[PDB]
Amino acid sequence: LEKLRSIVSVGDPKKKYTRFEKIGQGASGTVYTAMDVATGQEVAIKQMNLKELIINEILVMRENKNPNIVNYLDSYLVGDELWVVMEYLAGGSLTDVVTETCMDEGQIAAVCRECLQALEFLHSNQVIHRDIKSDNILLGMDGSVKLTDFGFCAQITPTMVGTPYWMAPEVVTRKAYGPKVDIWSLGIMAIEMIEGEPPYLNENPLRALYLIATNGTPELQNPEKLSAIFRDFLNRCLEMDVEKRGSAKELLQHQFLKIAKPLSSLTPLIAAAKEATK
Ligand SMILES: CCN1c2ccc(F)cc2N=C(N2CCN(C)CC2)c2cc(Cl)ccc21
């Protein structure tokens, strides 16, 4: 308990941050967006009701930073609650983009490369995300990409966790968590970028679990519309055999990512997808 108090930041976050807006809530905690009073920068704040495992989870994010994730900024202990302050991007989510606009292969390759760089970083720190999906991809107006975990699924490698439509078959059937489940989920997110939705989204989420466990590798609606290079990338993300499925490091070398357009190419999609607060 004393070590946890020594690692956390000094101060009252109720005074250091303002304009709190709840953006998510679950069994594990609550997510807010807030304004850093001193810097004028918009941040994201997780509030979790609480110990040596918490110490390790805090230390790994305080000591390790990467441009493609929302980075740890501070943490506070308020009674029995731990508050973790992190970066935030206000342009929108990849969900907004795929539901409202149509991305071309160059824009998909740009997003895939940024997400894989975030995954390579997390996996190199023995962290598995377990909840990769467009909802967890935040976008800046300039097209910058940051991965979030607003469903509280990520953890340092030590129950069924994740969002059913994006879950790997080995997670559904035997909870075999490992870095490759994030690669599968990235392949499902690439299908969102092509088709607007993950496979089976018209079904209820529990029925989706049975379809994933039985079908395995999902099929595309119109595969002939895609380049052979993009089809190969998707095959490597969605391999049934975990050993054959690409790692984030291996997929960063894929020819598909070599057609990536600059991130600035995303700005018109982000602007069109954005629904202004009335
Ligand atoms: C807020 C930062 N953060 C994170 C961002 C973004 C993301 F999607 C997952 C993250 N989770 C990280 N870990 C550790 C913390 N515990 C609670 C969850 C798993 C993490 C790891 C590392 Cl090496 C660096 C940053 C991380």
From Swiss-Prot:
Activated by binding small G proteins. Binding of GTP-bound CDC42 or RAC1 to the autoregulatory region releases monomers from the autoinhibited dimer, and enables activation by phosphorylation of Thr-159. Autophosphorylated in trans, meaning that in a dimer, one kinase molecule phosphorylates the other one. Activated by autophosphorylation at Thr-159 in response to a conformation change, triggered by interaction with GTP-bound CDC42 or RAC1. Activated by phosphorylation at Thr-159 by BRSK2 and by PDPK1. Phosphorylated by JAK2 in response to PRL; this increases PAK1 kinase activity. Its cofactor is Mg(2+). Keywords: Acetylation, Allosteric enzyme, Apoptosis, ATP-binding, Cell junction, Cell membrane, Cell projection, Chromosome, Cytoplasm, Cytoskeleton, Disease variant, Epilepsy, Exocytosis, Intellectual disability, Kinase, Membrane, Nucleotide-binding, Nucleus, Phosphoprotein, Serine/threonine-protein kinase, Transferase. Its EC number is 2.7.11.1. It is found in: Cytoplasm; Cell junction, Focal adhesion; Cell projection, Lamellipodium; Cell membrane. Residues 17-257 form the Protein kinase domain. Homodimer; homodimerization results in autoinhibition. Active as monomer. Interacts with GIT1. Component of cytoplasmic complexes, which also contains PXN, ARHGEF7 and GIT1. Interacts with NISCH. Interacts with DVL1; mediates the formation of a DVL1, MUSK and PAK1 ternary complex involved in AChR clustering. Binds to the caspase-cleaved p110 isoform of CDC2L1 and CDC2L2, p110C, but not the full-length proteins. Interacts with ARHGEF7. Interacts tightly with GTP-bound but not GDP-bound CDC42/P21 and RAC1. Interacts with SCRIB. Interacts with PDPK1. Interacts (via kinase domain) with RAF1. This is Serine/threonine-protein kinase PAK 1. It comes from Homo sapiens.
